[PDB]
Amino acid sequence: LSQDFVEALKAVVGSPHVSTASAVREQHGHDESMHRCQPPDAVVWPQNVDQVSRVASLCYNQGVPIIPFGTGTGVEGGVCAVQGGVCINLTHMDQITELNTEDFSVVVEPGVTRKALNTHLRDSGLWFPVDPGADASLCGMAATGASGTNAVRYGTMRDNVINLEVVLPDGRLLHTAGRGRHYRKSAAGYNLTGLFVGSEGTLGIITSTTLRLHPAPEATVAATCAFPSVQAAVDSTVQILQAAVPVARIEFLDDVMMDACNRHSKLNCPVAPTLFLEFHGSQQTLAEQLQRTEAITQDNGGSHFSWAAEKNELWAARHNAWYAALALSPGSKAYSTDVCVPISRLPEILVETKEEIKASKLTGAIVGHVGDGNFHCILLVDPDDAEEQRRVKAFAENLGRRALALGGTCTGEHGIGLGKRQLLQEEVGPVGVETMRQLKNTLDPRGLMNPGKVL
Ligand SMILES: Cc1cc2nc3c(=O)[nH]c(=O)nc-3n(C[C@H](O)[C@H](O)[C@H](O)COP(=O)(O)OP(=O)(O)OC[C@H]3O[C@@H](n4cnc5c(N)ncnc54)[C@H](O)[C@@H]3O)c2cc1C
Ligand SMILES: [Mn+2]
């Protein structure tokens, strides 16, 4: 980057909000994944959407790649600057606006996290349910198409994003569903909002998201249930879904993950394949769901439910499973798989994955949003041992391909980033790939919007 270009950036955002210092760039060259740190040439913090537009147009017309950066909690290398360029950290735009409690909607800027939003909504009777374990940017969650433990009942980001404000790569401002609009359904034209959810910063910069809010549950009950085997836990899961019990959360932990979480969080659950469950409803609604769910789990060998206000501890431990797995081998990094399959095929692939981790020299813990047919294999890697890194990559690719063989997808929520680009080509085939590329090319003709990712 030339000093003329750096001074032009400073003219837009202000001298304090541009940095070419190596330490600042290195901090913005990686996320939480094992993908090697690739530092951008500069980091820029725009203060309002006009500045985002002017930064993008400056980069775009000068041939400088743009990397949108939220909270850097992604796990597929989305923020790695594989071709250099300007990292745009969006978190100084941190305001909540247009809170419309009577319409169940709110507008947030990229610096707002889910925790910040739900704190703002305390005593409103409303909450935002999509819950990645990390304290992530909500606009980042829109960009990756995130989900979480609550998705089985309340939907993913795709279900709960109503509208997006997007700075296109050349600086034009798009409101995907129209400026200020919010509604429950529309057939007006082509649905542009869904194109930008899950685009990972390769189609434009999300500068605000309009989110669907939900009523807080009348009553809540949480529980854990220990099983004799992985098969018994996943069969119970499938049978619960096929019986249409509207569970609020249904999370699976294998024995390795249960032990890891015990050690990391001062939980002390029996070390066994375990379901964490949560139910929402009225008093009698809960009782009926509990009875039907306990009957199914018992038939598969489940323990009596170990019940859980502050006992928040349960789900905080789950949300930190990524770090619990890391702590099994301090100094390691982690790679996660993220397949999602037709639910009737979930038992076969989860059991086969357990058998394959056991038969291998890798350390892996299994944790999953199994109510969606989705699970994570969290594989640890020595950042220095390459033989291991190649064994971890090969394991993840084989798992991905088995999921594709079953009619599923290689990622339910984390995205493609750098890691799953070949699997995506296998998943949608040549006409799917060319169609996605044609969309990328019309929005980003010069290929400068987070290059090297997804496609
Ligand atoms: C402990 C832990 C638990 C997690 N649990 C979950 C989980 O349950 N579910 C889940 O889905 N994910 C989960 N994640 C992954 C991560 O939190 C999500 O993918 C999240 O959506 C990333 O948001 P971010 O702003 O931190 O992303 P970043 O790493 O900053 O960016 C991710 C990608 O999105 C792009 N991007 C970011 N912000 C924008 C923007 N405003 N406009 C356009 N593009 C943008 C970036 O360029 C990059 O390609 C977890 C991560 C951790 C560390
Ligand atoms: Mn997850």
Swiss-Prot record:
One annotated GO molecular function: D-lactate dehydrogenase (cytochrome) activity
Main location: mitochondrion
Tissues expressed in: Readily detected in liver and kidney, with a weaker signal observed in heart, skeletal muscle, stomach, brain, and lung.
The keyword Coiled coil is annotated on this UniProt entry: no
Cofactor(s) for this UniProt protein: FAD
Gene Ontology biological process terms in this record: ATP biosynthetic process; lactate catabolic process
SUPFAM superfamilies, A to Z: FAD-binding/transporter-associated domain-like, FAD-linked oxidases, C-terminal domain
Domain FAD-binding PCMH-type: 36-216
Modified-residue entries (N6-acetyllysine), positions: K10, K266, K393, K420
Domain of life of the source: Eukaryota
Keyword annotations: Acetylation, FAD, Flavoprotein, Mitochondrion, Oxidoreductase, Transit peptide
EC number of this enzyme: 1.1.2.4
Pfam (any one): FAD-oxidase_C
Role description: Involved in D-lactate, but not L-lactate catabolic process.
Subunit structure, interactors included: Interacts with CSRP3.
Protein name per the record: Probable D-lactate dehydrogenase, mitochondrial
